[PDB]
Amino acid sequence: ETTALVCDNGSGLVKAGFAGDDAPRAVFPSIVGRPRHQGVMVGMGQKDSYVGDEAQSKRGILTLKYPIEHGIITNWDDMEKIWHHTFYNELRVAPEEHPTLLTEAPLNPKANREKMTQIMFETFNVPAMYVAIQAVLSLYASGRTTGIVLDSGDGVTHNVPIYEGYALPHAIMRLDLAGRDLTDYLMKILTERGYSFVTTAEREIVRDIKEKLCYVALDFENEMATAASSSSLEKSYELPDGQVITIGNERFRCPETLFQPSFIGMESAGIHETTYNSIMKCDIDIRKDLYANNVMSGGTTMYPGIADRMQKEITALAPSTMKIKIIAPPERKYSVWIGGSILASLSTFQQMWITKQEYDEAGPSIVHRKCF
Amino acid sequence: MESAGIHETTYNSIMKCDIDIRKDLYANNVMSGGTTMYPGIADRMQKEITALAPSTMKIKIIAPPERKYSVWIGGSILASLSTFQQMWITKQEYDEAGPSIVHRKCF
Amino acid sequence: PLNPKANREKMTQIMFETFNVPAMYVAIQAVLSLYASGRTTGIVLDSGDGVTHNVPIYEGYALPHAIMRLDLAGRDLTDYLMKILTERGYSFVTTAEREIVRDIKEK
Amino acid sequence: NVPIYEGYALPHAIMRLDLAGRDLTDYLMKILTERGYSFVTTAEREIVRDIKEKLCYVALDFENEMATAASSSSLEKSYELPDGQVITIGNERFRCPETLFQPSFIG
Amino acid sequence: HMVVEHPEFLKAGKEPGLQIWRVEKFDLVPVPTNLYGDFFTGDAYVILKTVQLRNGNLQYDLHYWLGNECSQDESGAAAIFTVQLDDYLNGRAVQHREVQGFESATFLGYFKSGLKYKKGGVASGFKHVVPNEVVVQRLFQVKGRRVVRATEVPVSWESFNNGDCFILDLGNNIHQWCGSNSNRYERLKATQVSKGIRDNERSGRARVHVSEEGTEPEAMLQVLGPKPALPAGTEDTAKEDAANRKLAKLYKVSNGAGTMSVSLVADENPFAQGALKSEDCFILDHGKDGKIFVWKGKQANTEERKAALKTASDFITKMDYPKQTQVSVLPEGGETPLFKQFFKNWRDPDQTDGLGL
Ligand SMILES: Nc1ncnc2c1ncn2[C@@H]1O[C@H](COP(=O)(O)OP(=O)(O)OP(=O)(O)O)[C@@H](O)[C@H]1O
Ligand SMILES: [Ca+2]
Ligand SMILES: [Ca+2]
Ligand SMILES: [Ca+2]
Ligand SMILES: [Ca+2]
Ligand SMILES: [Ca+2]
Ligand SMILES: [Ca+2]
């Protein structure tokens, strides 16, 4: 009779809603703000901790902290504040009635799983609970049972090979750059034009500049040549102070950090050949399907031209005796939630819930044997 | 005096704030005091701030007719609020802490 | 704002010792003026007879680094009017004449 | 802050933190008002810079230095302004170098 | 590899043969036998063929077939039921993806007659929602001298007066209109209700605009029409303080006495926040403009909550409230700020006391 809840806890963007829906009900950034000046207007509803999009609204007069960094839960009290704001303020429901479905990062440490179980079962008193993986739920969102998933959100980039509807734990690999590092790179390469962004308050302004005005160059050197020669691609942006900035070659240099990590100094591989490195670690006989299902997921796959450049870079260094296609649905930024909505609404999911009484005579250890 | 006018003082008061809150502060300029009781000062203020600010912004200036006594009216409000009764500097706090209690309590 | 501390200690000392009040609070004028308007967000230009100060407050939180103060108010306007009235040959030197020039400035 | 390796800088690791002796001079201009000394214009900014150069020091630990400044008067010292008047400065001698370690003092 | 116990899988793969399943709203139904070999173009399907070997064991083969017009839930359901049916099996099966028009040659070989496709299919189990949508067009009059309260008023220029204050709610834009004859307390209440309806109902996804006479924005004039001559405003007396005092009725429902009990808590706002006990469930009835609020406790039983909803639904028909009355269900710590105005000094848990640090 009751409806389940899906809550995808992203590293910089958390999604939530009810099971059986074609889109998440609430999308809001996972930010906990704290005030940095003294409140002289007393009695007028001043709070010691602003959380969620409310913190994003009055972001100038706050210091902002991310409770999840790099896809892994670190600050737990702020993460409980994200949960309290999610259940009570956003979804406007009591947790005691509705079962709750959560999403976890691949290769999560088990202590984080046990503590997620403990603060769900003790603090909010849920009747049922379940934990699932980002990438395989994106693969179920793609309508496939076998493939690679490049899940590139705000914290990390994950490359997950899946065969027969199960991941292969030897072959999931992690590459630690995403849109936060792209925002910091764009923060670096706007200083030469004379515009300064140094604090966390205007970091979301630079993030909005990255979201509205970026594209992936199919070839980089000729795009340097045309950007240096002409000025057809130079476009203006309106800051909320009213100053108008203008952006030239920095519109497309910021996506290229993903393909060239030496732009921001680390020695690791770019996004195109680490998928090759992951797929060489798999068994041979599977690879004929495994190249064919190139599932792209995450909000940093929203750039125009990422698919054509991905197709070109895979087709350059894979052997030429095999066809490569790249698939990218328009809803792949919400695909983890869409997978959670379809899995929570199944006719076979009622026996896979972890009920309260099963938690009582097992403690916080039953989540390992059932979410598996 | 080589210091600039009240319009540029207002403008760089807005500019010293950080970038996210200029929008709301342009549209809520409030004047008070008897020295703002000249006729036509609001139009000159609107023209000078409209000249100094970028053209995309809307600038609104609030000049109520009771602005001479607005400090006292807000004082009657702040003394009348229910929250304020746990910020009174009592006699025993002054007796235990000297006159330096007022900088730890007020502002 | 930005008065010396010794004003606050001496004001505390004469209110608590001489008159023997049971409570005291002291507040900023521009905060009280923003209480009068009913808003929370805004910049208040409070200009009395001695002090003209700009205070911006976003939501409930004031920004003390953006507080501007200028000693340009009705006293200096009255004195400047007393200076420029000699161009028509009218001389005003005494304090009652300063009150009369204050009345003509108001009127 | 510039790292240099093999006699050449590393442009990815050079950073610019935008406060220096101008902002220290402006903060000392802010924190001399509470002793009753008023400096407003650019002519006496150089005097505040000279006061900052002659009488400042970085405290090794801040809170016990503030406690000893509040309790005793062994670190309070005088300066001779070029109009002949003598100012005195106490705990503000070391609070103004601390803005480099704590930028939240200037917001 | 945790095995499922759905009862329809018990007849799967027990004899050699060929079995077909159709998805209908996150569930499997087996299609009849004479409907084999043909499929709907707007549905997804699950295909099993299980084949006996010479040496004794029984091999399996799974396929999942997608139409070009099937919705997302049907395709994902076909994939997850293929995975769950393989998981119910002991991992001895192989899976294959089948696309409408682009099937494998072995898939054509199973059906003797061939493949024929018909339009239509079963409807999707999803319901259409957007992320972060509001469609709201309301107008609140706040009024009073000491006990200031809000009342919903219909959206027209004729409802405006100069003596009160008004809150025009238009979704992402909230407009605060102050009268010239309006006083200090209802201006403060209008500002407090405005910041509440921004930061609690919309969670900061709004922008609050403050305006007075002559400075009306284009949004107010576009929604409300051209501005007529305003019919002044009555001076704020003490009789409407008593009228605002008589607007809400706080009731209790609790099974602590071992039986059903609807009892009056109070009939005189401002109420006490401590009166809201956490083990019971309460009703506020501001039904003159059509609002009733069902406050649920954390330690309240389910039958108390159902009885509160039943009694609140009875209150439309008993006292003859008009037919736009909304039943708003409120848990602890997530209260609407229109509910908060009837209480004396509402305290959120993470509030700032004094100046703050
Ligand atoms: N149109 C866009 N253009 C560029 N970047 C975008 C766009 N839309 C979203 N992003 C970026 O995508 C990120 C958010 O994506 P997503 O919601 O998938 O991440 P997440 O779930 O929070 O992350 P993670 O998977 O690391 O936990 C942010 O860095 C955001 O700036
Ligand atoms: Ca994600
Ligand atoms: Ca004054
Ligand atoms: Ca269908
Ligand atoms: Ca198998
Ligand atoms: Ca009235
Ligand atoms: Ca009970």
Side-chain angles (χ1 to χ4, degrees):
Chain A
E1 196 273 323
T2 190
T3 58
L5 308 191
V6 190
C7 183
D8 174 34
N9 297 312
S11 67
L13 193 66
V14 54
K15 278 79 73 172
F18 292 90
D21 297 334
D22 64 337
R25 195 83 83 74
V27 189
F28 64 102
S30 64
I31 280 155
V32 174
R34 286 183 176 77
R36 47 179 280 203
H37 303 98
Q38 267 189 353
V40 309
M41 262 295 178
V42 289
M44 295 298 103
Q46 281 64 35
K47 295 191 285 294
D48 289 320
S49 175
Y50 297 86
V51 59
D53 210 316
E54 161 162 30
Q56 195 95 322
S57 75
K58 55 175 81 69
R59 67 196 170 185
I61 54 152
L62 301 173
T63 183
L64 310 182
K65 304 300 173 332
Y66 282 87
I68 296 155
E69 66 94 25
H70 294 339
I72 310 304
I73 293 155
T74 55
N75 194 351
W76 280 98
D77 303 332
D78 288 329
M79 254 294 295
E80 190 274 341
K81 289 182 181 180
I82 290 290
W83 298 5
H84 189 285
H85 172 257
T86 304
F87 290 127
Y88 295 108
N89 189 41
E90 292 288 318
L91 297 178
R92 202 78 66 170
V93 288
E96 287 79 0
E97 284 74 352
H98 312 336
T100 307
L101 177 62
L102 312 173
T103 67
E104 66 183 1
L107 301 186
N108 204 2
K110 313 316 298 302
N112 304 122
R113 192 192 293 275
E114 293 198 338
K115 295 295 292 296
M116 281 165 68
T117 297
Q118 194 273 328
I119 294 90
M120 293 296 173
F121 270 103
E122 269 67 5
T123 309
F124 301 107
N125 185 225
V126 300
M129 202 285 268
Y130 197 75
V131 193
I133 289 148
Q134 302 279 321
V136 66
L137 273 293
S138 278
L139 188 68
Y140 302 138
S142 82
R144 288 151 157 83
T145 59
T146 300
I148 191 81
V149 165
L150 188 143
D151 191 359
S152 68
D154 196 5
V156 298
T157 301
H158 266 292
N159 285 311
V160 176
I162 295 157
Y163 172 67
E164 297 275 87
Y166 278 91
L168 277 293
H170 153 67
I172 296 91
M173 79 192 317
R174 187 269 299 164
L175 194 70
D176 194 1
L177 81 170
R180 181 55 32 68
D181 291 337
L182 303 176
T183 306
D184 186 74
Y185 178 61
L186 180 52
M187 183 177 176
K188 186 69 73 171
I189 61 157
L190 285 190
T191 316
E192 54 259 31
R193 299 293 187 85
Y195 321 127
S196 59
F197 307 95
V198 296
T199 77
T200 53
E202 58 264 26
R203 190 180 290 160
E204 293 83 4
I205 297 165
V206 180
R207 191 181 49 68
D208 275 30
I209 289 154
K210 175 252 279 183
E211 288 179 355
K212 293 285 185 72
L213 300 167
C214 279
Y215 72 102
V216 176
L218 186 64
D219 189 3
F220 183 60
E221 281 76 1
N222 58 358
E223 203 73 27
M224 292 296 102
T226 49
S229 67
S230 73
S231 181
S232 43
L233 59 88
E234 191 172 2
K235 280 184 282 294
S236 302
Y237 186 87
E238 197 276 332
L239 295 165
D241 190 9
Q243 288 151 242
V244 176
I245 54 170
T246 182
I247 301 312
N249 60 351
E250 302 110 313
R251 202 190 167 214
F252 57 94
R253 279 208 293 124
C254 182
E256 290 287 324
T257 300
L258 296 150
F259 299 94
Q260 289 164 76
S262 46
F263 280 25
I264 59 170
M266 72 291 291
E267 60 89 12
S268 70
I271 58 165
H272 58 273
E273 73 280 24
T274 181
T275 62
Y276 189 84
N277 293 320
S278 79
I279 199 167
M280 294 298 103
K281 286 155 43 53
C282 295
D283 198 356
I284 305 302
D285 59 343
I286 290 153
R287 307 191 172 161
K288 295 291 107 178
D289 293 328
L290 189 48
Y291 272 114
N293 302 322
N294 290 318
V295 172
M296 295 299 103
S297 182
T300 51
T301 62
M302 294 298 103
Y303 300 89
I306 193 66
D308 299 332
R309 176 59 174 280
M310 201 36 49
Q311 175 70 51
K312 159 172 183 203
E313 292 277 22
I314 297 294
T315 310
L317 60 84
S320 195
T321 63
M322 184 177 177
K323 184 213 71 53
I324 300 288
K325 62 153 188 61
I326 313 295
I327 48 166
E331 63 273 17
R332 61 187 176 281
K333 66 186 287 188
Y334 304 139
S335 60
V336 177
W337 196 92
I338 302 301
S341 178
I342 182 165
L343 275 295
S345 64
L346 290 175
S347 71
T348 65
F349 204 74
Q350 57 265 24
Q351 60 265 24
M352 293 183 286
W353 286 113
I354 295 149
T355 60
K356 185 65 173 64
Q357 69 277 17
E358 288 173 357
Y359 173 78
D360 283 18
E361 60 252 18
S365 195
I366 193 162
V367 68
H368 309 284
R369 63 182 69 255
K370 279 176 82 75
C371 295
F372 182 76
Chain B
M1 328 202 280
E2 67 179 8
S3 65
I6 57 170
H7 60 284
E8 191 277 331
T9 317
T10 307
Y11 180 63
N12 61 16
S13 194
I14 293 301
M15 291 324 316
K16 282 187 79 65
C17 298
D18 58 343
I19 192 159
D20 283 308
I21 58 174
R22 277 73 171 280
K23 170 63 76 177
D24 196 356
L25 290 171
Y26 280 130
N28 294 317
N29 187 5
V30 178
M31 290 136 68
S32 68
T35 310
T36 50
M37 294 299 291
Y38 292 94
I41 191 165
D43 301 331
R44 176 56 167 285
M45 212 74 196
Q46 182 64 254
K47 191 176 76 170
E48 294 299 337
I49 299 167
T50 301
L52 287 172
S55 79
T56 51
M57 291 305 188
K58 182 63 178 95
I59 303 103
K60 190 187 293 218
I61 291 171
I62 306 302
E66 59 266 16
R67 61 173 168 282
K68 197 177 279 183
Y69 308 97
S70 83
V71 173
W72 189 93
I73 288 156
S76 178
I77 292 284
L78 183 62
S80 84
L81 293 202
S82 53
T83 315
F84 184 99
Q85 273 68 20
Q86 64 95 27
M87 282 73 74
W88 284 116
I89 295 92
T90 59
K91 185 64 177 293
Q92 61 269 21
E93 291 174 45
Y94 168 70
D95 294 327
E96 66 90 15
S100 185
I101 191 67
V102 69
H103 305 122
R104 292 190 287 103
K105 297 296 295 299
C106 287
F107 210 75
Chain C
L2 306 176
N3 277 113
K5 298 290 179 68
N7 199 257
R8 295 166 83 86
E9 280 101 3
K10 290 297 300 183
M11 185 180 288
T12 309
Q13 191 170 359
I14 293 89
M15 293 298 102
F16 271 107
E17 294 179 346
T18 311
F19 299 102
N20 310 100
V21 301
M24 181 156 138
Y25 197 97
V26 286
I28 303 300
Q29 286 185 147
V31 174
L32 275 178
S33 279
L34 188 42
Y35 263 118
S37 72
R39 292 179 178 74
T40 65
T41 57
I43 180 154
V44 174
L45 184 146
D46 188 292
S47 184
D49 199 2
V51 180
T52 296
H53 55 108
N54 286 325
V55 176
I57 293 152
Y58 189 72
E59 307 305 316
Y61 301 88
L63 281 79
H65 63 97
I67 298 314
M68 320 324 278
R69 168 154 172 195
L70 183 65
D71 294 303
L72 174 53
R75 186 70 63 80
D76 316 326
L77 303 178
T78 303
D79 293 332
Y80 182 66
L81 183 56
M82 221 185 308
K83 293 269 219 188
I84 56 157
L85 277 171
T86 61
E87 303 285 13
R88 300 225 182 213
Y90 317 132
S91 63
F92 295 112
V93 296
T94 64
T95 49
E97 291 169 341
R98 164 146 56 88
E99 298 294 309
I100 287 152
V101 172
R102 188 175 59 74
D103 205 70
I104 207 178
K105 183 183 81 177
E106 284 181 357
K107 280 190 172 65
Chain D
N1 284 311
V2 175
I4 286 156
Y5 175 63
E6 296 277 86
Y8 279 90
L10 312 183
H12 91 263
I14 297 169
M15 293 183 286
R16 168 165 139 160
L17 184 63
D18 196 358
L19 81 169
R22 190 71 67 72
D23 292 337
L24 301 176
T25 306
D26 294 4
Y27 181 67
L28 181 53
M29 271 194 88
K30 184 68 73 172
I31 66 154
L32 283 190
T33 52
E34 65 272 24
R35 297 290 186 82
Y37 318 129
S38 59
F39 307 97
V40 295
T41 66
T42 48
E44 57 263 27
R45 188 181 287 162
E46 304 297 323
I47 296 165
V48 179
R49 191 180 49 68
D50 272 29
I51 289 155
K52 181 265 290 181
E53 287 182 355
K54 293 285 183 72
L55 299 167
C56 281
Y57 71 102
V58 177
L60 186 63
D61 184 74
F62 184 60
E63 48 265 41
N64 58 356
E65 196 69 26
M66 281 216 85
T68 48
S71 68
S72 73
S73 179
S74 43
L75 58 88
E76 189 173 1
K77 279 184 283 295
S78 303
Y79 185 86
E80 195 275 335
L81 294 169
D83 63 342
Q85 197 273 355
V86 175
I87 56 173
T88 182
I89 185 164
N91 60 351
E92 305 105 312
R93 204 189 168 213
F94 57 89
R95 280 208 292 122
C96 171
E98 286 285 322
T99 315
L100 295 151
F101 303 95
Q102 291 164 78
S104 44
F105 280 23
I106 55 166
Chain E
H1 58 84
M2 201 301 299
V3 295
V4 298
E5 291 81 1
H6 187 72
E8 201 268 325
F9 291 167
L10 274 292
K11 62 177 77 65
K14 307 294 178 315
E15 63 287 10
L18 189 144
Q19 292 178 356
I20 297 169
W21 276 291
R22 182 177 170 189
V23 301
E24 299 88 354
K25 297 180 174 65
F26 318 107
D27 198 352
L28 293 163
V29 176
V31 70
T33 306
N34 63 86
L35 270 292
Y36 274 35
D38 50 352
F39 299 112
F40 285 110
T41 195
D43 282 6
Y45 285 89
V46 176
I47 308 85
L48 179 62
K49 189 173 177 62
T50 178
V51 174
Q52 190 69 65
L53 274 295
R54 281 82 63 193
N55 59 356
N57 69 344
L58 183 66
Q59 72 179 2
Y60 323 116
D61 192 0
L62 276 296
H63 314 68
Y64 56 102
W65 182 92
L66 283 71
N68 290 119
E69 293 82 3
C70 65
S71 54
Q72 194 303 340
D73 58 298
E74 292 171 327
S75 65
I80 193 66
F81 279 131
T82 302
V83 170
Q84 285 180 354
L85 189 152
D86 199 348
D87 196 359
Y88 182 76
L89 273 47
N90 57 359
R92 287 179 67 254
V94 293
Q95 300 156 29
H96 296 285
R97 193 160 164 286
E98 297 290 328
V99 176
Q100 184 205 340
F102 303 160
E103 291 82 352
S104 57
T106 185
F107 198 76
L108 274 292
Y110 298 124
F111 301 130
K112 277 74 69 175
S113 312
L115 277 294
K116 307 95 174 172
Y117 296 155
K118 272 79 75 173
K119 301 131 172 183
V122 72
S124 83
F126 285 168
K127 54 179 77 66
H128 211 56
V129 302
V130 185
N132 299 114
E133 61 280 49
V134 292
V135 64
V136 179
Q137 187 174 1
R138 314 188 274 169
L139 183 64
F140 297 95
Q141 182 191 38
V142 303
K143 182 179 175 67
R145 187 73 181 85
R146 294 289 192 273
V147 184
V148 192
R149 290 289 178 276
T151 307
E152 190 173 2
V153 285
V155 182
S156 179
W157 264 123
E158 64 90 23
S159 177
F160 274 60
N161 57 355
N162 203 359
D164 311 331
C165 285
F166 291 88
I167 302 302
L168 184 76
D169 190 0
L170 311 172
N172 300 301
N173 294 275
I174 300 152
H175 299 84
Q176 176 171 322
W177 190 87
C178 290
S180 296
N181 314 323
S182 65
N183 61 2
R184 53 233 217 99
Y185 293 110
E186 75 200 356
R187 272 192 296 246
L188 275 177
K189 183 60 66 174
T191 304
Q192 188 188 135
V193 169
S194 300
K195 300 291 172 68
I197 191 167
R198 173 156 61 77
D199 293 290
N200 192 6
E201 196 200 30
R202 277 75 175 279
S203 305
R205 283 186 290 276
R207 294 180 66 250
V208 171
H209 302 115
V210 182
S211 301
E212 293 83 3
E213 285 78 358
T215 63
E216 282 74 359
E218 175 47 34
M220 293 180 183
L221 306 182
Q222 189 270 329
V223 172
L224 210 55
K227 187 174 177 180
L230 183 63
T234 59
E235 71 305 345
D236 275 323
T237 63
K239 65 98 177 179
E240 65 273 16
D241 296 333
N244 290 327
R245 193 177 294 276
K246 302 287 103 174
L247 292 178
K249 296 180 183 291
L250 194 72
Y251 303 170
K252 184 177 184 181
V253 174
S254 181
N255 300 7
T259 187
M260 187 66 204
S261 64
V262 183
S263 62
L264 176 67
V265 187
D267 200 358
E268 189 273 326
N269 61 85
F271 305 125
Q273 196 179 355
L276 292 178
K277 303 293 185 291
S278 173
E279 294 83 1
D280 302 324
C281 76
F282 292 93
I283 297 89
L284 197 144
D285 190 0
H286 187 273
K288 268 68 71 176
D289 59 353
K291 271 189 314 304
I292 190 167
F293 293 68
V294 186
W295 180 107
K296 300 194 294 192
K298 281 171 73 173
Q299 292 81 16
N301 302 114
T302 60
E303 62 271 19
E304 288 168 287
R305 301 164 199 231
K306 289 188 284 293
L309 189 146
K310 188 269 183 182
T311 314
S313 53
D314 290 329
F315 291 171
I316 297 89
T317 68
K318 290 174 73 174
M319 283 73 74
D320 189 359
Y321 296 157
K323 186 37 61 195
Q324 63 277 15
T325 297
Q326 43 183 9
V327 181
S328 46
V329 190
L330 264 55
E332 293 197 354
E335 291 97 323
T336 310
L338 286 165
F339 175 82
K340 285 177 204 179
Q341 65 188 353
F342 305 102
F343 288 79
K344 178 63 73 67
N345 288 5
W346 190 272
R347 261 202 74 82
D348 291 331
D350 292 331
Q351 284 206 327
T352 305
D353 303 328
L355 293 174
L357 280 74

